[PDB]
Amino acid sequence: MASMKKKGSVVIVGRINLSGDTAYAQQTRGEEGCQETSQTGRDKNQVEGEVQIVSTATQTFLATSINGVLWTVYHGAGTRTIASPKGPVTQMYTNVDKDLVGWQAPQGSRSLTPCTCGSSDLYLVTRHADVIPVRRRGDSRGSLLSPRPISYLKGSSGGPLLCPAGHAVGIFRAAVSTRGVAKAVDFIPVESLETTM
Ligand SMILES: COc1ccc2nc(C)c(O[C@@H]3C[C@H]4C(=O)N[C@]5(C(=O)NS(=O)(=O)C6(C)CC6)C[C@H]5/C=C\CCCCC[C@H](NC(=O)OCC5(C(F)(F)F)CC5)C(=O)N4C3)nc2c1
Ligand SMILES: [Zn+2]
């Protein structure tokens, strides 16, 4: 009982810069500092942007700010706190049935606006700053216009699907693959986020 360990916090280790005309990933913290920060839960780094790259001790994925909430997947974050300048921050949303968790958006982040366009021409942003066109096929499904191996999508759960105007349409959750080729993606629709709020 006295030897029971405590799981570390999720740690922001970078971001996907969507500011200019070129999307590109930036790293803000290395492996060693990530491990240190996950154990203390103290992260003094400045946060910027909409899409964060986050990591635990064993997994790395994405987290996206929408309406002042940093959203990500439960299968990445579990019930973990997130590191912040003042210590670990407890999740304000947890829904395992949706594979969804959320924390208050970090100070300095920018939030995407929920989409009300009703458009089916979407764009998935990956951890490698690829902007993949995706056609919406259902409430929670979309097909890649250019299929590719699932390797290129691994580590991008928690990333956004965006409409043509840059609104948040959903959060990337799972990949539909055949023979290792991702033909479609499963995502948490922004409306499901809005009802959880
Ligand atoms: C524990 O408590 C919970 C509660 C609810 C929950 N709900 C889920 C739907 C779920 O799914 C698992 C994780 C997800 C994934 O890996 N997601 C990423 C991703 O990148 N993760 S990650 O960032 O690398 C990582 C692991 C660090 C965090 C985007 C994928 C990228 C590549 C796929 C790799 C092969 C996998 C193909 C697989 N496909 C699929 O399950 O098909 C189903 C389905 C669908 F419609 F798609 F839902 C009916 C057809 C898939 O995508 N899985 C498997 N786990 C949970 C767990
Ligand atoms: Zn829109």
Short mmCIF file of C-alpha atoms and ligand atoms in Angstrom, two decimals:
data_model
loop_
_atom_site.label_atom_id
_atom_site.label_comp_id
_atom_site.label_asym_id
_atom_site.label_seq_id
_atom_site.Cartn_x
_atom_site.Cartn_y
_atom_site.Cartn_z
CA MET A 1 0.00 0.00 0.00
CA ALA A 2 2.82 2.39 0.88
CA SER A 3 4.66 1.25 -2.27
CA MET A 4 1.76 1.96 -4.62
CA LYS A 5 2.85 4.24 -7.46
CA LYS A 6 0.88 7.12 -8.99
CA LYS A 7 0.48 7.54 -12.74
CA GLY A 8 2.05 10.64 -14.23
CA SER A 9 0.33 13.57 -15.88
CA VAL A 10 -0.19 14.13 -19.57
CA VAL A 11 2.46 16.58 -20.79
CA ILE A 12 2.39 18.97 -23.75
CA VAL A 13 5.56 18.28 -25.74
CA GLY A 14 4.83 20.34 -28.85
CA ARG A 15 2.18 21.72 -31.15
CA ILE A 16 0.96 21.78 -34.74
CA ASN A 17 1.49 25.32 -36.03
CA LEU A 18 -1.45 26.31 -38.24
CA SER A 19 -0.70 30.04 -38.07
CA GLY A 20 0.87 30.84 -41.45
CA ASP A 21 0.48 29.37 -44.92
CA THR A 22 2.42 26.21 -43.98
CA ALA A 23 1.40 23.67 -41.34
CA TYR A 24 4.33 22.23 -39.42
CA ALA A 25 4.96 20.47 -36.13
CA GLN A 26 7.04 22.13 -33.42
CA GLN A 27 8.47 20.34 -30.39
CA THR A 28 8.59 22.33 -27.16
CA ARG A 29 9.98 19.72 -24.74
CA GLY A 30 12.32 16.75 -25.10
CA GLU A 31 12.11 13.20 -23.77
CA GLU A 32 13.93 13.87 -20.50
CA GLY A 33 11.98 17.01 -19.62
CA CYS A 34 8.74 15.23 -20.52
CA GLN A 35 9.45 12.43 -18.05
CA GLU A 36 10.39 14.97 -15.37
CA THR A 37 7.23 17.00 -16.02
CA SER A 38 4.93 13.97 -16.05
CA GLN A 39 6.06 13.02 -12.53
CA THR A 40 5.83 16.49 -10.97
CA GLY A 41 2.86 17.72 -12.98
CA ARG A 42 4.62 21.11 -13.08
CA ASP A 43 4.96 22.57 -16.60
CA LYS A 44 6.22 26.15 -16.87
CA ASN A 45 6.46 26.19 -20.67
CA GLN A 46 4.39 28.73 -22.58
CA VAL A 47 1.50 27.15 -24.48
CA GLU A 48 0.36 28.42 -27.89
CA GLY A 49 -1.95 27.34 -30.67
CA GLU A 50 -4.96 25.09 -31.13
CA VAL A 51 -3.48 21.59 -31.56
CA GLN A 52 -1.08 20.34 -28.89
CA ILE A 53 1.17 17.30 -29.10
CA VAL A 54 0.92 15.49 -25.77
CA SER A 55 2.65 12.51 -24.22
CA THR A 56 2.51 10.18 -21.25
CA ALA A 57 5.38 7.94 -20.16
CA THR A 58 4.23 5.33 -22.70
CA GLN A 59 2.07 7.05 -25.35
CA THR A 60 2.03 10.16 -27.53
CA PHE A 61 -0.99 11.66 -29.26
CA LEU A 62 -2.73 15.00 -29.84
CA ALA A 63 -5.04 17.32 -27.92
CA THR A 64 -7.23 20.04 -29.43
CA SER A 65 -8.71 23.15 -27.81
CA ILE A 66 -12.36 23.82 -28.71
CA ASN A 67 -14.49 26.36 -26.80
CA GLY A 68 -11.95 26.73 -24.02
CA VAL A 69 -11.55 22.97 -23.46
CA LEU A 70 -8.47 20.91 -24.36
CA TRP A 71 -9.94 17.68 -25.75
CA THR A 72 -8.26 14.33 -26.35
CA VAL A 73 -9.01 10.58 -26.35
CA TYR A 74 -9.54 8.43 -23.27
CA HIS A 75 -7.48 5.60 -24.78
CA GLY A 76 -4.51 7.97 -24.74
CA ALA A 77 -5.00 9.98 -21.56
CA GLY A 78 -7.12 7.65 -19.45
CA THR A 79 -8.15 9.51 -16.30
CA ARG A 80 -4.80 11.31 -16.04
CA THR A 81 -4.25 14.88 -14.94
CA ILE A 82 -2.43 17.27 -17.28
CA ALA A 83 0.69 19.18 -16.28
CA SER A 84 0.30 22.92 -15.76
CA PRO A 85 2.35 25.79 -14.29
CA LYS A 86 0.68 25.33 -10.88
CA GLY A 87 0.65 21.52 -10.84
CA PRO A 88 -1.53 18.70 -12.14
CA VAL A 89 -4.98 19.67 -13.41
CA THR A 90 -7.87 17.24 -13.03
CA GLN A 91 -10.04 16.41 -16.02
CA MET A 92 -13.30 18.35 -16.19
CA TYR A 93 -14.74 15.89 -18.74
CA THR A 94 -14.42 12.10 -18.88
CA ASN A 95 -16.59 9.89 -21.11
CA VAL A 96 -15.25 6.40 -21.79
CA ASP A 97 -18.31 5.57 -23.90
CA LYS A 98 -17.17 8.33 -26.29
CA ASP A 99 -13.41 7.70 -25.82
CA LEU A 100 -13.31 11.36 -24.77
CA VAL A 101 -11.62 13.39 -22.04
CA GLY A 102 -11.12 17.10 -21.54
CA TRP A 103 -9.26 19.62 -19.41
CA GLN A 104 -9.64 23.37 -19.15
CA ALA A 105 -7.74 24.89 -22.07
CA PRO A 106 -4.19 25.93 -21.05
CA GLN A 107 -3.43 29.59 -20.52
CA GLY A 108 -2.10 30.97 -23.80
CA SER A 109 -3.78 28.42 -26.07
CA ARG A 110 -6.19 29.36 -28.84
CA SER A 111 -9.53 27.56 -29.19
CA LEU A 112 -11.10 26.41 -32.43
CA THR A 113 -14.71 27.43 -33.01
CA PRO A 114 -17.33 24.66 -33.27
CA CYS A 115 -18.49 24.30 -36.85
CA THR A 116 -22.06 25.18 -37.79
CA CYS A 117 -21.43 25.10 -41.56
CA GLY A 118 -22.92 21.65 -42.11
CA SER A 119 -20.22 20.93 -44.70
CA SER A 120 -18.94 17.44 -45.52
CA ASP A 121 -15.59 18.55 -47.00
CA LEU A 122 -13.30 18.08 -44.00
CA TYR A 123 -9.57 18.19 -43.26
CA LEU A 124 -7.75 16.02 -40.73
CA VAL A 125 -4.63 17.47 -39.07
CA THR A 126 -2.09 14.84 -38.02
CA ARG A 127 0.78 14.98 -35.54
CA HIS A 128 3.16 15.37 -38.51
CA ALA A 129 1.26 18.48 -39.70
CA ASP A 130 -0.28 16.69 -42.67
CA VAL A 131 -3.62 18.20 -43.71
CA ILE A 132 -5.53 15.23 -45.11
CA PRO A 133 -8.75 15.90 -47.07
CA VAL A 134 -11.60 13.78 -45.69
CA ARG A 135 -15.16 13.52 -47.02
CA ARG A 136 -17.74 13.21 -44.24
CA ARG A 137 -19.70 9.97 -44.60
CA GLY A 138 -21.77 10.00 -41.41
CA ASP A 139 -22.23 11.52 -37.99
CA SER A 140 -18.88 10.09 -36.89
CA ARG A 141 -17.22 8.78 -40.08
CA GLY A 142 -15.20 10.20 -42.96
CA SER A 143 -13.30 8.69 -45.86
CA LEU A 144 -9.78 9.64 -46.87
CA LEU A 145 -9.68 11.08 -50.37
CA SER A 146 -6.20 9.51 -50.66
CA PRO A 147 -5.94 6.32 -48.58
CA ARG A 148 -2.59 5.57 -46.97
CA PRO A 149 -1.10 3.12 -44.45
CA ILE A 150 -2.36 3.43 -40.89
CA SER A 151 1.24 4.17 -39.87
CA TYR A 152 0.74 7.76 -41.05
CA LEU A 153 -2.28 8.23 -38.75
CA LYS A 154 -0.86 6.50 -35.66
CA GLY A 155 -0.35 9.04 -32.89
CA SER A 156 -2.88 11.54 -34.25
CA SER A 157 -5.90 10.67 -32.11
CA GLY A 158 -7.14 13.81 -30.39
CA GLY A 159 -6.38 15.87 -33.48
CA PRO A 160 -9.05 17.91 -35.25
CA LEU A 161 -11.17 17.42 -38.31
CA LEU A 162 -11.80 20.90 -39.72
CA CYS A 163 -14.31 22.36 -42.16
CA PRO A 164 -13.21 24.55 -45.09
CA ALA A 165 -13.52 27.64 -42.87
CA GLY A 166 -11.26 26.20 -40.17
CA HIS A 167 -14.00 25.32 -37.68
CA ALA A 168 -13.71 22.22 -35.50
CA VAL A 169 -15.97 19.45 -36.82
CA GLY A 170 -14.67 16.58 -34.71
CA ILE A 171 -11.87 14.90 -32.79
CA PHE A 172 -9.96 12.03 -34.44
CA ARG A 173 -10.70 8.80 -32.56
CA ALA A 174 -10.05 5.67 -34.63
CA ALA A 175 -8.97 4.52 -38.08
CA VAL A 176 -10.86 2.14 -40.36
CA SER A 177 -8.29 0.06 -42.24
CA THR A 178 -8.21 -2.81 -44.72
CA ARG A 179 -4.91 -4.67 -45.17
CA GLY A 180 -3.19 -1.93 -43.17
CA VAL A 181 -4.50 0.84 -45.44
CA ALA A 182 -6.57 3.56 -43.77
CA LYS A 183 -9.61 4.20 -45.97
CA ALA A 184 -11.78 5.97 -43.38
CA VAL A 185 -11.60 7.62 -39.96
CA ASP A 186 -13.88 7.57 -36.93
CA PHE A 187 -14.18 10.80 -34.95
CA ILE A 188 -16.08 12.38 -32.07
CA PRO A 189 -18.41 14.99 -33.62
CA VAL A 190 -18.16 18.49 -32.20
CA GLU A 191 -21.86 18.31 -31.29
CA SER A 192 -21.07 15.38 -28.99
CA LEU A 193 -18.47 17.64 -27.38
CA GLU A 194 -20.97 20.50 -27.12
CA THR A 195 -23.54 18.28 -25.39
CA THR A 196 -20.91 17.02 -22.94
CA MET A 197 -20.18 20.65 -22.04
C1 LIG B 1 -9.32 2.11 -22.81
O1 LIG B 1 -10.55 2.79 -22.84
C2 LIG B 1 -11.10 2.98 -24.12
C3 LIG B 1 -12.50 3.59 -24.28
C4 LIG B 1 -13.10 3.80 -25.68
C5 LIG B 1 -12.27 3.39 -26.94
N1 LIG B 1 -12.83 3.59 -28.30
C6 LIG B 1 -12.05 3.20 -29.47
C7 LIG B 1 -12.63 3.40 -30.88
C8 LIG B 1 -10.64 2.59 -29.29
O2 LIG B 1 -9.88 2.21 -30.42
C9 LIG B 1 -8.51 1.85 -30.08
C10 LIG B 1 -7.71 2.88 -30.05
C11 LIG B 1 -7.83 3.43 -31.63
C12 LIG B 1 -6.65 4.13 -32.23
O3 LIG B 1 -5.58 3.62 -32.29
N2 LIG B 1 -6.93 5.46 -32.78
C13 LIG B 1 -5.98 6.35 -33.50
C14 LIG B 1 -4.63 6.68 -32.82
O4 LIG B 1 -3.80 7.31 -33.41
N3 LIG B 1 -4.32 6.25 -31.46
S1 LIG B 1 -2.80 6.69 -30.82
O5 LIG B 1 -2.61 8.14 -30.84
O6 LIG B 1 -1.71 6.20 -31.67
C15 LIG B 1 -2.65 6.00 -29.12
C16 LIG B 1 -2.92 4.51 -28.87
C17 LIG B 1 -1.58 6.65 -28.23
C18 LIG B 1 -3.06 6.96 -28.00
C19 LIG B 1 -6.14 7.30 -34.69
C20 LIG B 1 -5.66 5.86 -34.93
C21 LIG B 1 -4.43 5.72 -35.86
C22 LIG B 1 -4.07 4.56 -36.44
C23 LIG B 1 -4.84 3.23 -36.23
C24 LIG B 1 -3.84 2.16 -35.72
C25 LIG B 1 -4.52 0.76 -35.73
C26 LIG B 1 -5.71 0.75 -34.72
C27 LIG B 1 -7.05 0.71 -35.52
C28 LIG B 1 -8.25 0.92 -34.58
N4 LIG B 1 -9.47 0.91 -35.36
C29 LIG B 1 -10.75 0.55 -34.73
O7 LIG B 1 -10.81 0.37 -33.56
O8 LIG B 1 -11.90 0.43 -35.55
C30 LIG B 1 -13.13 0.49 -34.85
C31 LIG B 1 -14.16 1.14 -35.80
C32 LIG B 1 -14.21 2.67 -35.88
F1 LIG B 1 -15.27 3.08 -36.64
F2 LIG B 1 -13.05 3.12 -36.43
F3 LIG B 1 -14.34 3.17 -34.61
C33 LIG B 1 -15.46 0.37 -36.06
C34 LIG B 1 -14.37 0.42 -37.14
C35 LIG B 1 -8.12 2.27 -33.87
O9 LIG B 1 -8.11 3.28 -34.49
N5 LIG B 1 -7.99 2.31 -32.40
C36 LIG B 1 -7.97 1.07 -31.39
N6 LIG B 1 -10.09 2.40 -27.95
C37 LIG B 1 -10.89 2.79 -26.78
C38 LIG B 1 -10.29 2.58 -25.36
ZN ZN B 2 -17.51 25.35 -40.39
#
